[PDB]
């Protein structure tokens, strides 16, 4: 048998928070799925090198944020850092 995990269900959840009455085609979900995995690989790859470059063996929030600052253009980066910081803070409070 075969089991292929995905980001499908999470992308759909996010869609409902942003546009509750809108749906999405299979091909579009695939594209969305490729995009998230892409961004994941990109950011993590850069963070990986950042850790290597600065002779650290741990990827922390610090590297990810800096990786984000490097890869995302202008305003995108700013809000991405805002969202990143927000989430990590709330998670630490528990």
């Amino acid at each position: 048998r075969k089991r292929k995990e995905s980001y499908a269900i999470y992308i759909y959840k996010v869609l409902k928070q942003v546009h509750p009455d809108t749906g999405i085609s299979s091909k579009a979900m695939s594209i969305m799925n490729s995009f998230v995995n892409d961004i994941f690989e990109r950011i993590a790859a850069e963070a990986s090198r950042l850790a290597h470059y600065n002779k650290r063996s741990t990827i922390t929030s610090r590297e990810i944020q800096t990786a984000v600052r490097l890869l995302l253009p202008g305003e995108l980066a700013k809000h991405a850092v805002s969202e990143g910081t927000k989430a990590v803070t709330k998670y630490t409070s528990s």
Partner: protein, 78 residues
């Protein structure tokens, strides 16, 4: 059979590119540029196929090839 990619097929693409007038010499040049493009991508694709020890080129092989050349494609996985 490379003559198969014809004028009316080429001319639609140009239209989509926003082109209004096309020199007759454009059509053969386009066939040539396209072959080159395909040669490079197919080359890397097959290279991935052989590393996996497969005789069938999968879609991922093509995707990985396109990514290697900075032309990532969405809607086939990857």
């Amino acid at each position: 059979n490379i003559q198969g990619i014809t004028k009316p097929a080429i001319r639609r693409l140009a239209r989509r590119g926003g082109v209004k007038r096309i020199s007759g010499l454009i059509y053969e040049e386009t066939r040539g540029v396209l072959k080159v493009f395909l040669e490079n991508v197919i080359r890397d694709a097959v290279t991935y196929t052989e590393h996996a020890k497969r005789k069938t080129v999968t879609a991922m092989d093509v995707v990985y090839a396109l990514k290697r050349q900075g032309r990532t494609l969405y809607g086939f996985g990857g």
